[PDB]
Protein backbone atom coordinates (compact mmCIF):
# COMPACT_ATOMS: atom_id res chain seq x y z
CA UNK A 1 0.00 0.00 0.00
CA UNK A 2 1.24 3.45 -1.03
CA UNK A 3 0.26 6.30 1.25
CA UNK A 4 -2.17 8.71 -0.50
CA UNK A 5 0.29 11.60 -0.69
CA UNK A 6 -0.58 12.32 -4.32
CA UNK A 7 -4.19 12.88 -3.25
CA UNK A 8 -2.98 15.76 -1.05
CA UNK A 9 -0.18 17.37 -3.06
CA UNK A 10 -1.62 17.09 -6.58
CA UNK A 11 -5.19 17.91 -5.49
CA UNK A 12 -7.20 20.11 -7.82
CA UNK A 13 -8.65 22.42 -5.15
CA UNK A 14 -7.08 23.48 -1.86
CA UNK A 15 -8.84 24.75 1.23
CA UNK A 16 -8.80 28.24 2.66
CA UNK A 17 -6.39 28.62 5.56
CA UNK A 18 -9.17 29.19 8.10
CA UNK A 19 -10.90 25.97 6.92
CA UNK A 20 -7.80 23.93 6.02
CA UNK A 21 -8.19 20.23 5.33
CA UNK A 22 -6.71 17.35 7.31
CA UNK A 23 -6.31 13.91 5.79
CA UNK A 24 -5.37 11.19 8.25
CA UNK A 25 -2.72 8.89 6.76
CA UNK A 26 -2.89 5.36 8.13
CA UNK A 27 -1.94 1.73 7.42
CA UNK A 28 0.33 2.34 4.44
CA UNK A 29 3.95 2.64 3.29
CA UNK A 30 5.15 6.20 2.64
CA UNK A 31 8.05 7.02 0.30
CA UNK A 32 9.34 10.44 1.37
CA UNK A 33 11.99 10.40 -1.38
CA UNK A 34 9.53 11.52 -4.07
CA UNK A 35 8.89 14.53 -1.82
CA UNK A 36 12.30 15.96 -0.89
CA UNK A 37 13.43 15.15 -4.45
CA UNK A 38 11.37 17.80 -6.24
CA UNK A 39 12.23 21.25 -7.55
CA UNK A 40 8.69 22.60 -7.06
CA UNK A 41 8.91 22.94 -3.26
CA UNK A 42 10.13 26.45 -2.42
CA UNK A 43 10.08 25.50 1.26
CA UNK A 44 10.89 22.11 2.82
CA UNK A 45 11.44 22.61 6.56
CA UNK A 46 11.32 19.63 8.92
CA UNK A 47 11.17 19.75 12.71
CA UNK A 48 12.17 16.85 14.97
CA UNK A 49 13.18 14.59 12.04
CA UNK A 50 15.70 14.65 9.20
CA UNK A 51 14.16 14.82 5.70
CA UNK A 52 16.34 11.99 4.38
CA UNK A 53 15.97 9.81 7.51
CA UNK A 54 12.19 9.71 7.00
CA UNK A 55 12.11 6.39 5.07
CA UNK A 56 13.70 4.68 8.09
CA UNK A 57 11.05 5.32 10.80
CA UNK A 58 7.51 4.25 11.67
CA UNK A 59 4.63 6.15 13.26
CA UNK A 60 1.11 5.31 14.40
CA UNK A 61 -0.67 8.06 12.42
CA UNK A 62 0.47 10.70 9.93
CA UNK A 63 -1.57 13.87 9.42
CA UNK A 64 -1.49 15.91 6.20
CA UNK A 65 -2.92 19.43 6.56
CA UNK A 66 -3.24 21.58 3.44
CA UNK A 67 -4.34 25.15 2.67
CA UNK A 68 -3.43 28.28 0.70
CA UNK A 69 -1.77 31.43 2.09
CA UNK A 70 0.50 34.20 0.82
CA UNK A 71 4.23 33.78 0.38
CA UNK A 72 4.74 36.53 2.96
CA UNK A 73 3.02 34.30 5.51
CA UNK A 74 4.68 30.90 5.04
CA UNK A 75 7.17 32.06 7.70
CA UNK A 76 4.34 31.67 10.27
CA UNK A 77 3.77 27.97 9.55
CA UNK A 78 6.42 27.00 12.09
CA UNK A 79 6.52 26.31 15.84
CA UNK A 80 6.77 29.41 18.00
CA UNK A 81 5.61 31.97 15.42
CA UNK A 82 3.04 34.74 15.68
CA UNK A 83 0.95 36.68 13.20
CA UNK A 84 -2.59 36.67 11.82
CA UNK A 85 -2.13 33.17 10.36
CA UNK A 86 -0.49 31.47 13.32
CA UNK A 87 -2.68 33.31 15.85
CA UNK A 88 -6.06 33.07 14.13
CA UNK A 89 -5.87 30.52 11.30
CA UNK A 90 -3.32 27.69 11.63
CA UNK A 91 -1.29 27.06 14.79
CA UNK A 92 1.61 24.63 15.21
CA UNK A 93 2.52 23.47 18.74
CA UNK A 94 5.94 24.33 20.05
CA UNK A 95 6.87 20.64 20.38
CA UNK A 96 6.02 20.11 16.71
CA UNK A 97 7.36 16.97 15.02
CA UNK A 98 7.02 16.95 11.25
CA UNK A 99 7.64 18.78 8.00
CA UNK A 100 6.20 21.97 6.51
CA UNK A 101 6.46 22.39 2.75
CA UNK A 102 5.10 25.02 0.40
CA UNK A 103 5.21 25.89 -3.29
CA UNK A 104 4.12 28.82 -5.45
CA UNK A 105 0.62 28.31 -6.90
CA UNK A 106 0.12 31.63 -8.71
CA UNK A 107 -0.82 30.06 -12.06
CA UNK A 108 -3.40 27.86 -10.28
CA UNK A 109 -4.94 29.98 -7.51
CA UNK A 110 -4.76 33.60 -8.72
CA UNK A 111 -6.85 35.06 -11.53
CA UNK A 112 -7.33 38.38 -13.29
CA UNK A 113 -9.65 40.66 -11.34
CA UNK A 114 -8.86 38.83 -8.09
CA UNK A 115 -9.59 35.37 -6.69
CA UNK A 116 -12.06 35.67 -3.82
CA UNK A 117 -12.47 31.98 -2.96
CA UNK A 118 -9.50 31.88 -0.54
CA UNK A 119 -10.22 33.47 2.83
CA UNK A 120 -8.43 34.01 6.13
CA UNK A 121 -9.78 34.87 9.57
CA UNK A 122 -8.93 38.50 10.37
CA UNK A 123 -10.81 38.92 13.69
CA UNK A 124 -10.69 36.62 16.71
CA UNK A 125 -10.76 37.55 20.38
CA UNK A 126 -8.30 34.79 21.41
CA UNK A 127 -5.35 32.89 19.98
CA UNK A 128 -6.04 29.45 18.56
CA UNK A 129 -4.90 26.49 20.45
CA UNK A 130 -2.28 24.38 18.62
CA UNK A 131 -4.42 22.00 16.58
CA UNK A 132 -7.70 23.85 17.43
CA UNK A 133 -9.38 25.83 14.60
CA UNK A 134 -12.80 27.30 14.11
CA UNK A 135 -15.10 27.49 11.14
CA UNK A 136 -17.35 30.23 12.52
CA UNK A 137 -19.10 32.99 10.57
CA UNK A 138 -20.47 34.97 13.57
CA UNK A 139 -19.68 38.63 12.98
CA UNK A 140 -17.11 40.26 15.22
CA UNK A 141 -18.31 42.71 17.89
CA UNK A 142 -15.64 45.43 18.03
CA UNK A 143 -17.73 47.85 20.10
CA UNK A 144 -20.00 47.65 23.13
CA UNK A 145 -23.19 47.78 21.06
CA UNK A 146 -24.21 44.17 20.30
CA UNK A 147 -24.37 43.38 16.60
CA UNK A 148 -27.49 41.16 16.51
CA UNK A 149 -26.18 39.49 13.36
CA UNK A 150 -26.09 42.69 11.27
CA UNK A 151 -22.74 43.48 9.66
CA UNK A 152 -22.08 47.20 10.09
CA UNK A 153 -19.85 49.64 11.97
CA UNK A 154 -17.80 47.99 14.75
CA UNK A 155 -19.58 44.79 13.59
CA UNK A 156 -17.26 43.20 11.05
CA UNK A 157 -17.33 39.95 9.11
CA UNK A 158 -14.49 37.84 10.58
CA UNK A 159 -13.06 36.71 7.21
CA UNK A 160 -11.49 38.55 4.36
CA UNK A 161 -10.49 37.30 0.94
CA UNK A 162 -6.89 37.31 -0.25
CA UNK A 163 -8.03 38.52 -3.66
CA UNK A 164 -5.07 36.70 -5.18
CA UNK A 165 -4.12 38.45 -8.41
CA UNK A 166 -1.45 37.18 -10.82
CA UNK A 167 0.29 40.53 -11.19
CA UNK A 168 1.51 41.22 -7.63
CA UNK A 169 4.99 40.55 -6.32
CA UNK A 170 6.05 37.13 -5.12
CA UNK A 171 5.27 37.90 -1.48
CA UNK A 172 1.58 38.40 -2.31
CA UNK A 173 1.24 35.42 -4.63
CA UNK A 174 -0.70 32.38 -3.37
CA UNK A 175 1.30 29.46 -1.99
CA UNK A 176 -0.03 25.97 -1.36
CA UNK A 177 1.16 24.53 1.95
CA UNK A 178 1.18 20.92 3.17
CA UNK A 179 2.06 20.15 6.79
CA UNK A 180 2.95 16.58 7.78
CA UNK A 181 2.50 15.64 11.45
CA UNK A 182 4.09 12.51 12.92
CA UNK A 183 2.84 10.79 16.08
Amino acid sequence: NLCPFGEVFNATRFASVYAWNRKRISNCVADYSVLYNSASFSTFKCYGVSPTKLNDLCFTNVYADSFVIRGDEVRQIAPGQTGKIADYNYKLPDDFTGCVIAWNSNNLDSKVGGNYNYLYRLFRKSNLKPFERDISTEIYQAGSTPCNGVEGFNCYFPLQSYGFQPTNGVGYQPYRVVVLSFE
Partner: antibody
Amino acid sequence: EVQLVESGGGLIQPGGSLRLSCAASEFIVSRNYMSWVRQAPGKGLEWVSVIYSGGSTYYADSVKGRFTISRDNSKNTLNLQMNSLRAEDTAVYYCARDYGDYYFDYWGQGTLVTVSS
Amino acid sequence: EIVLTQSPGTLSLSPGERATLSCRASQGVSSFLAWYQQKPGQAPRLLIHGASSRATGIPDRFSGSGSGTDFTLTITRLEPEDFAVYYCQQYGSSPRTFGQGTKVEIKR
Protein backbone atom coordinates in the same frame (compact mmCIF):
# COMPACT_ATOMS: atom_id res chain seq x y z
CA GLU B 1 -19.61 59.44 19.97
CA VAL B 2 -16.70 57.06 19.60
CA GLN B 3 -13.55 58.57 21.08
CA LEU B 4 -9.85 58.00 21.81
CA VAL B 5 -8.29 60.29 24.43
CA GLU B 6 -4.54 60.13 25.01
CA SER B 7 -2.97 61.23 28.29
CA GLY B 8 0.26 60.94 30.22
CA GLY B 9 2.55 63.09 28.09
CA GLY B 10 4.86 65.86 29.21
CA LEU B 11 8.50 66.78 29.68
CA ILE B 12 10.92 64.00 30.63
CA GLN B 13 14.69 63.78 30.98
CA PRO B 14 16.81 61.62 28.66
CA GLY B 15 17.05 58.06 29.94
CA GLY B 16 13.84 58.47 31.93
CA SER B 17 10.58 56.57 31.64
CA LEU B 18 7.02 57.54 30.84
CA ARG B 19 3.64 55.80 30.56
CA LEU B 20 1.04 56.85 27.98
CA SER B 21 -2.67 56.16 28.36
CA CYS B 22 -5.56 56.18 25.89
CA ALA B 23 -9.20 55.93 26.97
CA ALA B 24 -11.66 54.44 24.47
CA SER B 25 -15.37 55.22 24.39
CA GLU B 26 -17.24 52.82 22.12
CA PHE B 27 -14.42 50.53 21.04
CA ILE B 28 -13.39 47.70 23.36
CA VAL B 29 -9.58 47.88 23.17
CA SER B 30 -9.41 44.19 24.13
CA ARG B 31 -11.31 43.19 20.98
CA ASN B 32 -9.42 45.44 18.57
CA TYR B 33 -6.05 45.95 16.98
CA MET B 34 -4.76 49.12 18.66
CA SER B 35 -1.67 51.04 17.55
CA TRP B 36 0.56 53.92 18.59
CA VAL B 37 1.81 56.33 15.92
CA ARG B 38 4.17 59.21 16.70
CA GLN B 39 4.93 62.42 14.85
CA ALA B 40 7.99 64.56 15.52
CA PRO B 41 7.46 68.33 15.20
CA GLY B 42 7.63 69.24 11.53
CA LYS B 43 8.45 65.75 10.27
CA GLY B 44 6.28 62.84 9.01
CA LEU B 45 4.46 59.90 10.58
CA GLU B 46 6.08 56.83 12.13
CA TRP B 47 4.33 53.71 13.39
CA VAL B 48 5.53 52.68 16.87
CA SER B 49 3.76 49.56 18.15
CA VAL B 50 0.62 47.46 17.77
CA ILE B 51 -1.28 45.02 19.97
CA TYR B 52 -3.36 42.35 18.25
CA SER B 53 -6.93 41.56 19.26
CA GLY B 54 -5.52 38.25 20.55
CA GLY B 55 -2.60 39.66 22.54
CA SER B 56 0.26 39.60 20.03
CA THR B 57 2.52 42.65 20.08
CA TYR B 58 4.94 44.16 17.57
CA TYR B 59 7.28 47.15 17.73
CA ALA B 60 9.21 49.31 15.31
CA ASP B 61 12.93 48.60 15.37
CA SER B 62 13.69 52.06 16.82
CA VAL B 63 11.76 51.39 20.06
CA LYS B 64 12.47 47.69 20.61
CA GLY B 65 13.60 46.76 24.10
CA ARG B 66 12.45 50.17 25.36
CA PHE B 67 8.71 50.44 24.69
CA THR B 68 6.06 47.96 25.84
CA ILE B 69 2.45 48.10 24.67
CA SER B 70 -0.32 46.78 26.90
CA ARG B 71 -3.99 47.23 27.70
CA ASP B 72 -6.32 47.14 30.69
CA ASN B 73 -9.75 45.57 30.21
CA SER B 74 -11.35 46.81 33.44
CA LYS B 75 -10.80 50.43 32.36
CA ASN B 76 -10.89 49.97 28.54
CA THR B 77 -7.45 51.56 28.18
CA LEU B 78 -4.52 51.20 25.79
CA ASN B 79 -1.11 51.82 27.36
CA LEU B 80 2.46 52.43 26.20
CA GLN B 81 5.31 52.04 28.70
CA MET B 82 8.27 54.01 27.33
CA ASN B 83 11.69 53.51 28.93
CA SER B 84 15.17 54.86 28.19
CA LEU B 85 13.76 57.87 26.38
CA ARG B 86 16.05 59.74 23.95
CA ALA B 87 15.69 63.07 22.03
CA GLU B 88 14.85 61.29 19.06
CA ASP B 89 11.64 60.21 20.78
CA THR B 90 10.26 63.76 21.10
CA ALA B 91 6.97 63.64 19.20
CA VAL B 92 3.20 63.77 19.43
CA TYR B 93 1.97 60.25 20.23
CA TYR B 94 -1.40 59.12 18.85
CA CYS B 95 -3.43 56.05 19.70
CA ALA B 96 -5.28 54.74 16.66
CA ARG B 97 -7.61 51.84 16.24
CA ASP B 98 -5.93 49.47 13.81
CA TYR B 99 -8.20 47.84 11.24
CA GLY B 100 -6.69 44.38 10.90
CA ASP B 101 -3.09 45.60 11.29
CA TYR B 102 -3.51 47.36 7.93
CA TYR B 103 -4.58 51.03 8.21
CA PHE B 104 -5.53 53.50 10.94
CA ASP B 105 -9.16 54.56 10.54
CA TYR B 106 -9.83 56.28 13.89
CA TRP B 107 -7.25 58.43 15.69
CA GLY B 108 -7.06 60.37 18.92
CA GLN B 109 -5.98 63.98 19.31
CA GLY B 110 -2.49 63.02 20.51
CA THR B 111 -0.31 63.79 23.52
CA LEU B 112 3.01 65.62 23.37
CA VAL B 113 6.14 63.94 24.76
CA THR B 114 9.25 66.10 25.16
CA VAL B 115 12.56 64.41 26.00
CA SER B 116 15.00 67.16 26.95
CA SER B 117 17.63 67.83 29.60
CA GLU C 1 11.49 48.60 4.65
CA ILE C 2 9.36 50.10 1.90
CA VAL C 3 10.22 53.75 1.28
CA LEU C 4 7.20 55.74 0.07
CA THR C 5 8.29 58.83 -1.88
CA GLN C 6 5.55 61.40 -2.48
CA SER C 7 5.63 64.02 -5.22
CA PRO C 8 5.36 66.86 -5.57
CA GLY C 9 6.40 68.17 -2.16
CA THR C 10 4.13 71.22 -2.35
CA LEU C 11 1.12 71.52 -4.65
CA SER C 12 -0.07 75.10 -5.11
CA LEU C 13 -3.50 75.20 -6.79
CA SER C 14 -6.63 77.34 -6.72
CA PRO C 15 -9.94 76.07 -5.27
CA GLY C 16 -11.94 74.25 -7.92
CA GLU C 17 -8.83 73.01 -9.73
CA ARG C 18 -7.98 69.32 -10.02
CA ALA C 19 -5.31 67.93 -7.68
CA THR C 20 -3.19 64.87 -8.49
CA LEU C 21 -0.86 63.50 -5.80
CA SER C 22 1.62 60.68 -6.46
CA CYS C 23 3.10 58.09 -4.10
CA ARG C 24 5.78 55.61 -5.19
CA ALA C 25 6.87 52.53 -3.26
CA SER C 26 10.46 51.30 -3.34
CA GLN C 27 9.05 47.85 -4.18
CA GLY C 28 5.56 46.56 -4.87
CA VAL C 29 2.80 46.73 -2.25
CA SER C 30 -0.08 45.53 -4.48
CA SER C 31 -3.27 47.43 -3.47
CA PHE C 32 -2.30 47.71 0.22
CA LEU C 33 -2.05 51.50 0.31
CA ALA C 34 -3.97 54.07 2.36
CA TRP C 35 -4.20 57.86 2.13
CA TYR C 36 -4.57 60.28 5.05
CA GLN C 37 -5.36 63.98 5.38
CA GLN C 38 -3.85 66.13 8.14
CA LYS C 39 -4.76 69.71 8.99
CA PRO C 40 -2.30 71.79 11.04
CA GLY C 41 -2.63 71.28 14.77
CA GLN C 42 -5.01 68.29 14.66
CA ALA C 43 -4.82 64.58 13.94
CA PRO C 44 -4.65 62.66 10.63
CA ARG C 45 -7.89 61.41 9.08
CA LEU C 46 -8.31 58.32 6.91
CA LEU C 47 -9.35 59.17 3.34
CA ILE C 48 -9.07 55.97 1.28
CA HIS C 49 -7.85 52.45 1.90
CA GLY C 50 -7.09 49.60 -0.48
CA ALA C 51 -5.68 52.17 -2.93
CA SER C 52 -9.20 53.04 -4.14
CA SER C 53 -11.87 52.55 -1.43
CA ARG C 54 -13.17 55.63 0.37
CA ALA C 55 -13.45 55.53 4.14
CA THR C 56 -16.71 56.26 5.91
CA GLY C 57 -18.09 59.73 5.22
CA ILE C 58 -15.49 60.71 2.59
CA PRO C 59 -17.00 62.80 -0.23
CA ASP C 60 -16.81 61.21 -3.70
CA ARG C 61 -14.48 63.99 -4.89
CA PHE C 62 -11.67 61.89 -3.35
CA SER C 63 -10.56 58.89 -5.40
CA GLY C 64 -7.49 56.67 -5.47
CA SER C 65 -5.82 54.71 -8.25
CA GLY C 66 -2.85 52.46 -8.85
CA SER C 67 -1.28 49.19 -7.80
CA GLY C 68 2.18 47.76 -7.27
CA THR C 69 4.48 50.77 -6.98
CA ASP C 70 2.43 53.65 -8.47
CA PHE C 71 -0.47 55.34 -6.75
CA THR C 72 -2.34 58.58 -7.30
CA LEU C 73 -4.79 60.46 -5.11
CA THR C 74 -7.13 62.79 -6.99
CA ILE C 75 -9.31 65.57 -5.62
CA THR C 76 -11.59 66.42 -8.54
CA ARG C 77 -13.13 69.75 -7.45
CA LEU C 78 -11.08 71.27 -4.61
CA GLU C 79 -13.21 72.68 -1.80
CA PRO C 80 -11.53 75.26 0.49
CA GLU C 81 -11.43 72.70 3.34
CA ASP C 82 -9.44 70.25 1.18
CA PHE C 83 -6.23 72.29 1.52
CA ALA C 84 -4.08 70.34 3.98
CA VAL C 85 -1.26 67.78 4.06
CA TYR C 86 -1.80 64.33 2.55
CA TYR C 87 0.16 61.19 3.48
CA CYS C 88 0.28 57.73 1.94
CA GLN C 89 0.80 54.60 4.03
CA GLN C 90 1.50 51.06 2.83
CA TYR C 91 0.56 47.87 4.66
CA GLY C 92 1.96 45.32 2.23
CA SER C 93 5.09 44.20 4.05
CA SER C 94 7.86 45.08 6.54
CA PRO C 95 7.07 47.75 9.12
CA ARG C 96 4.18 49.88 7.95
CA THR C 97 5.68 53.06 6.50
CA PHE C 98 4.26 56.49 5.70
CA GLY C 99 5.09 58.88 2.92
CA GLN C 100 6.76 62.16 3.82
CA GLY C 101 3.67 64.14 2.83
CA THR C 102 2.43 66.47 0.11
CA LYS C 103 1.05 69.87 1.10
CA VAL C 104 -1.73 71.28 -1.04
CA GLU C 105 -1.53 75.01 -0.39
CA ILE C 106 -3.86 77.58 -1.97
CA LYS C 107 -2.74 79.62 -4.94
CA ARG C 108 -3.53 83.31 -5.22
